[PDB]
Amino acid sequence: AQGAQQIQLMRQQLIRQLRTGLGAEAVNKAAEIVRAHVADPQAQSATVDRFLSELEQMSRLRAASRQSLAALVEKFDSVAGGLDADGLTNLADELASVAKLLLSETALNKHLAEPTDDSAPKVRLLERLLSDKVSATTLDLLRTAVSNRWSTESNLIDAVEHTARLALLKRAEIAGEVDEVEEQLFRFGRVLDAEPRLSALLSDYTTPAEGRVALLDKALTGRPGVNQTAAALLSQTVGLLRGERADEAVIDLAELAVSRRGEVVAHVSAAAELSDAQRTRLTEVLSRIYGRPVSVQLHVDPELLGGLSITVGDEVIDGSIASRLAAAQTGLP
Amino acid sequence: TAGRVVRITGPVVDVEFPRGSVPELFNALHAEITFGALAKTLTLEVAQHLGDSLVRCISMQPTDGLVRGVEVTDTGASISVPVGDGVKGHVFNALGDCLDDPGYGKDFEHWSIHRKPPAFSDLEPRTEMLETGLKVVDLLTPYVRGGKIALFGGAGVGKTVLIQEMINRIARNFGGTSVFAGVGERTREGNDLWVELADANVLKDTALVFGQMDEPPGTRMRVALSALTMAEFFRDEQGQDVLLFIDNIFRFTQAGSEVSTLLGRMPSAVGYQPTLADEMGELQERITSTRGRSITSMQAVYVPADDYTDPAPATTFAHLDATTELSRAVFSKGIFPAVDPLASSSTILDPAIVGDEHYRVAQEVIRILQRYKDLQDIIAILGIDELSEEDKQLVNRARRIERFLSQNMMAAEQFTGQPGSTVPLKETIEAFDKLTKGEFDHLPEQAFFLIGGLDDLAKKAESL
Amino acid sequence: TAGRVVRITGPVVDVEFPRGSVPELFNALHAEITFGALAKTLTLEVAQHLGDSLVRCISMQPTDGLVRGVEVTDTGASISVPVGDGVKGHVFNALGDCLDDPGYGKDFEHWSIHRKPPAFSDLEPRTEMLETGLKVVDLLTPYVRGGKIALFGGAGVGKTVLIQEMINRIARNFGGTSVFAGVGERTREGNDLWVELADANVLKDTALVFGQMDEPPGTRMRVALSALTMAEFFRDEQGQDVLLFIDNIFRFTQAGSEVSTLLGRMPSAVGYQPTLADEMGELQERITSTRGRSITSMQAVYVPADDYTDPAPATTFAHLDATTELSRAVFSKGIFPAVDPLASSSTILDPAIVGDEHYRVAQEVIRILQRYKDLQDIIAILGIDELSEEDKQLVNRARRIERFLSQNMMAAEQFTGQPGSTVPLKETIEAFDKLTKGEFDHLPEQAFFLIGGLDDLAKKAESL
Amino acid sequence: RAQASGEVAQTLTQADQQLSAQGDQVRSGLESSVDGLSAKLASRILGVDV
Amino acid sequence: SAADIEGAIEDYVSSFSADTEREEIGTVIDAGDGIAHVEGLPSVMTQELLEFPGGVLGVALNLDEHSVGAVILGEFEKIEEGQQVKRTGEVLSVPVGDAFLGRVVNPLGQPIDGQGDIAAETRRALELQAPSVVQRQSVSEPLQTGIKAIDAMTPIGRGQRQLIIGDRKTGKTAVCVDTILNQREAWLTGDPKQQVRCVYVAIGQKGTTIASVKRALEEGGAMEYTTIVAAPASDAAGFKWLAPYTGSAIGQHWMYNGKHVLIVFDDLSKQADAYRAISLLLRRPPGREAFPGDVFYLHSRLLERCAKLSDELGGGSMTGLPIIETKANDISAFIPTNVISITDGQCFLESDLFNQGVRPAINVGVSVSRVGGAAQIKAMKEVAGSLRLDLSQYRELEAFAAFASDLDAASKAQLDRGARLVELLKQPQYSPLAVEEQVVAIFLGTQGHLDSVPVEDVQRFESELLEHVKASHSDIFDGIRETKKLSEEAEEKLVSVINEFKKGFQASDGSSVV
Amino acid sequence: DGQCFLESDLFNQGVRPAINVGVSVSRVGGAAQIKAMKEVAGSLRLDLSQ
């Protein structure tokens, strides 16, 4: 009986392995079929439109630093009501200057960052070393920041630098170039994602900041196509990395830029640069899904076999025909 | 205001609260596991403040299924247990949830399980013997009112029958109650105890508080405190003498060690928590007599590697006033309650706390039993006839003494019907004085089995 | 898109790569040391991905002379070793570079040292006895043809001598292919084995891979895998019965421990790495034999501190069918091969496989030896004269049995001067049945020392 | 037991051969239906007839 | 053969549809030694089952504000920095059903014996609550291990947790395989109240050893009611950690359905070692012997699933037989101490007893079963009542073996009785004895019918006598089995047949036994 | 390649230079001796251990 069961199990093993081979051949043939079918432009557009139709049916700061940064942002919002374009540029430049000072004077940053509840001593050190050298608006925010306690010393810098960015973003708000500055920021982000040697060169903060800024100007922002606000933001960032990635930092800067305006960036990958019709359809469906305006950023990826994939926040909506083919392949019994 | 879980490493859960609302230590916090299969309400006990408004907590329930960022609500008070006459006759877990009747006692008065021991000026300066009524305990190893008794034993040595006997005696003679603190229960053993007590009809006089083994170490560490808090309520509010069983207080020590390891504290000598003595003191010091009422405790103790110098038993025995050791050899001889008169001990068997007559009689009985135990080898190998006449006389007297140390326990009333005997201490003293002097060496040995006092001895002798 | 060395700490080297070119785990990377005295191409093995596009690698050659910032180029595949019939008759290192003929196999087929163990579906137990000719092994620890065999021992108890003797007794007449993996053993004994094999014309059928202890932890980790890859090629791609001698397999786990703390792992008990069991299990499971494809593997295992409770030997025990266990206690008494007859064991020593006669004789020998071990405490103090007559006779039996388990092995000619001997299994069973039954109690015990057979016993008895 | 083991071993090999071939036969019909199965799978993944 | 070779695939292609559901993604930021840290996955839950790109699986085991440290379940080398990790919304679960009988499955429930798939009836999470105090029942039904020593001295009642503890190569796996084999007679009855379904969980054993155990069970007929949850040493530390829970879940599914289960963990020491490895790789604080603080809980949470359920829950039971390897017979080590505390009793196997020929090598006296006589049938309870005292007296008297002339008559009789009882408790491997045969065998010794047989022949005298009784006087066995007690008329018949056999028995020394 | 395990107990007994014959060993052995010494002392260490 054991031998009979052995031959029965051999028969079942043969059946299973033949079925596995048949399934492998079948999906390989289906892969060829889809590769031929996806190559058509009208077919690819129809596939992405079908994907959108399907969709139609659907912060690292700790507590103390988080609250302090929220308070500093509120103070910046209060101050910005009476600021001006030139005043905003001066505020951004002076905030970047104090960020540089804090990075250079580690002891100065550490006492301006101590978690002491007493603010008077701190503010006294502040003005003593910087009161007459900077404007008034700057100090107001630049002190609010010092008064609040921070979880770590570096956070204080991250606070002022954050404001230094907002000062420029508010400037873009003043000029109405939010769309242009965001587009240029994402363009620079994708540019720095490629050629990682340039990203590493910009990343090195051991070298003088002026050299990195000059390199960026010669490479990226020294040409007429760069928007003024985007160029200023990139220069400030390159000046204030402190070991962070350049491409990482610039994409986070773009995320902050969209976030200031209440929108959330959704990175979209497609086989080709879809037309404006399905682009506006995608924006609407994504906003409906997430209940918040979204700014779609496209990335060229012909390997997706004519499908469309979205990633926003920690969530993804994947309909890439390549991923669906992989799921079919791995789903073989 | 409500916290958020920010870390989950096994039983250890870190909760971030708003700056103005960090719970104080040992507060019980509630988190919700919404996963269908494992849906639960975790009770986290705040153990440390880490800073930046974080608090590290030991989860009293398995944290499987817990999600980061889930709301954690602070109850504002430490782990509270229901207290009252209602806890009697019911089984509870370390957190006061009734196991045999869910939702029972949720509307009782609740007491925090973290209570300071009695004020120094409120302690009783004089040790007082607890006349439990058992001949063996009252004579050889007198128990201490408001003291702790180690209960060495195992399976098939009548430990559960002795527990029932002491529950009956505390409930009937002293008008008190019992609380059974099942630290590290085997759920099978806990169920067996529950059914045994229900069948014996002594469940109504005992409140069971089981911290099972399957629960994380937090509950196994806090169950002793919970049961002791019920006992404290009975002592201080109801004004009853209490009998707090703790099977097994080594578990409590080991649960403390595991909690200490989980929180990251460097282990002490043999891997035990650095605060072993302080945890054991905070537990045991609450078991004491105050304002005329006392919590006595029979605490079964496990001795790792049979090493009494180990930190856990060494710390436990700094508080143990008596030591009752049940023996398989004595149990097989028909001598219930199965206490070994020689291995057991007491720290009150001194001429001063007990009467000089008591000490003399007890020492004479111990001498006779020791001489007999020495002669056991000769009897077993060489035979009884190879002894001398003085040795044979002593062997007969020792047989009769050790059989008279047996007693018709109240716990046996459910099996035979014969009411249990409560032999007065004076009667036991004089009876054993007579035995050791040979006044009863002419009665048959079967006359001394399972009988309380000289009246019962005479009646049984006449019945044979 | 080459890497860059960032952090060098002994054998561990951290390499930062561009974001899109972080090598997979166990990949081989090539750095270059340019200092003239130590100039070389340094092979690193990606051991951890550490984030931020950093990887942490275990260097195969010494890192002396390596400079931070030096370019590190990724090979794109794990360390590969040559395989084929070409490897037979040559000496390789962990990296697959031939020593006795540099650049020899550079054009052979190359296999990765890392591969999954054979699937459980393809494993069947092996129950065929391998007659070595050693009395103790053939009687009490019969080896399994196609099974896993180990020679446990302390430091310097004769593991290398015994494994060389087993090469002499199993491989010399073997029709298949042999592989010898010297994993962190002594280079002198490796060269001795090389010349011995060359002189006996076994080298043409043997592939030697050496990672001796002069090498850093990386080679002492990966050399066992490098040799096991050749063994697996011979097992799978050719179907030839394969012998796989390893000396010493403990050095694998010891090298893992050596690099453990530099890789950031928290040490486990006795300072070993947390991954001791899994790391050793992968390697051991690759050594098994699959049905129709036999690997007869013999692994000398080193027991640290002569402590058989150490985690490494204890974990290795589960991976073995036959386990000879050399002990310093037996070695001190002059018994060579120094096997502890009681601690050693074999799974093929069942009455259904070795026969009822062999099993009975082996179990009677073990019984006598265990009784002798129990009596040795008494004899050293109370003297032999105070033992029972039966126990005295048993002691005289056991001394002769212990000395008869000693044997003059061929590989130990330079330990004793006299040539080696081979004892058929039938003669061993007959001789030990006679001993255990008494036919030799009249002969002096020194007649049983280093003789190997009944004829030799008679000759040495006559010479006495 | 030895005779049963030998006969079962012989039966097994006989069966191993028969299976092997039976499988080759079927392998053919397999390659005949592969085209249709692949077309159906491609239509499924694409969400429309291929 | 059939058209299915194509049809099955057709059924897939017609039925397959990869729909577009939203998914939360993490990215692997660290990976090493079997642990992968995954940034992201905000909604991941503790002990969730993450899926990595290459079909690899991991268990979200440490959750921080920065990363999720997940233990990878095999194929760890395929994990890289930057890989996308998708969360399956399910805590660790395993399939369960009657289809697992006769199958070898890895701790995830996937077959590894090479046969077809397993038709799962349901899925059970590995971390479900154990039966509560109110849901249990007193252990009162025997689980005949077939080993005279265990069934007479330390009986195991279904619903119990008995620990086979001892050093290496002492006879533990032999005891548990014998216990599994002994249930074939119960299985062939067809009565679920008698049938015992077995789950042999192999942790850290080599593949060939699991194959050997499977062969021992098949040649013994036990594989038609036994599942082998195998986590061979080749498998990741995660599988060695999960295997007891997998086996416990497969058993629990039967247990809550009225069936009786027998779970063998072999060993739990390797379970503890795998958990220690995972904990240290996740940087959880260490304690004694480097084990994490909750290692006790790891075992307790497991062994407390082994319970006898109340009649309201079907009355099913799961019997635990954890196996622990004690190094140098040190039962005071950490894991041995923990599991001795957890379990209801201990069969202590000693290498000294094994070498003396006392194999199966249970050190009676030190060995204990807290369930006691409640786990024995009345016949064994009455027959084996005096056995423990007799063996204790024999061990006390062993020092006098050389002076039997100088001892009292009673003492010498006790010594002679004890030697024969010791020979009686010996038992060959893979040969469990039915409870009736054990009753008759222990009756031979305790009642003094072996007192005339030479010691060296006791093993034979028993073996032949039963072989006689079974073949010719089965009425005794049938009575003991059907009534569970040794009736007086049956006892007289048994004594008469013993005396008749004595006359025809040839002692190995040539003497006559009457 | 060997040990010369010098023992304090042997040293005090007057066995100087204190070689514990049982534990001590040289695995090069006779190869590191002149033929006369090898022949004269072939089994000397084992004889002394016994």
Ligand SMILES: Nc1ncnc2c1ncn2[C@@H]1O[C@H](COP(=O)(O)OP(=O)(O)OP(=O)(O)O)[C@@H](O)[C@H]1O
């Ligand atoms: N009752 C017995 N009679 C005879 N031999 C036995 C008996 N029990 C076990 N053995 C033998 O003892 C050896 C050890 O058996 P087993 O494999 O069960 O040990 P174990 O305690 O599980 O150890 P390991 O750690 O190697 O798994 C094997 O040779 C087995 O055949």
Ligand SMILES: [Mg+2]
């Ligand atoms: Mg085993």
